[PDB]
Amino acid sequence: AKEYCRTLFPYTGTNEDELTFREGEIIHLISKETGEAGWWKGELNGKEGVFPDNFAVQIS
Amino acid sequence: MQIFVKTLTGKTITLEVEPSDTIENVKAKIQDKEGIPPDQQRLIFAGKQLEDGRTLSDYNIQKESTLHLVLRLRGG
């Protein structure tokens, strides 16, 4: 129905496929399985990417 | 100057490399201990990826700093 997560710390993408998240933000959960341990997949302002060691907590 | 090298697995490693040191050298050091090849090593600092041809002084990396090591990027 709806599964999102809140960003607890700032993260800046280093690659074009990477996502950038600030504190007090809203990350949409796409797939907790990215093939890399500690990395989840979410969608942000038109761009999709992963974050290091879970920078988002499923609020919904 | 000591430095922390974190990993997605939660493994933090200590390394000794002054500011003048080059990023390429740093990767070589990590490879000496952890065995991981520099070709797969990804160093993240301040939200930017460290350039092999640059030095710790370029990114203003001081002692007791934390460097995120990304290994095998299956995601994106």
Check A39 against B75: CB less than 8 A apart.
Answer: yes
Q: Which residue does chain B place closest to A15, by CA atoms? A: B76
Q: Does B8 touch chain A (CB under 8 A)?
A: yes
SS3 B33: helix
* Structure determination method: NMR
Q: Cβ distance B44 to B24 under 8 Å?
A: no
SS3 A56: strand
How many cross-chain Cβ pairs, A to B, lie less than 8 Å apart?
49
The domain spanning residue A22 has which CATH number? Answer: 2.30.30.40
Computed on alpha carbons and rounded to an integer, the radius of gyration of chain B in Å comes to 11
Q: How many domains does chain A have?
A: 1
Residue type, B14: T
Q: How far is CA A33 from CA A21, A52, A55, B39, B61, in A?
A: 19, 13, 15, 24, 32
Phi, then psi, of B29 in degrees rounded to 5: -65, -50
Domains and CATH numbers, chain B: 1-76 (3.10.20.90)
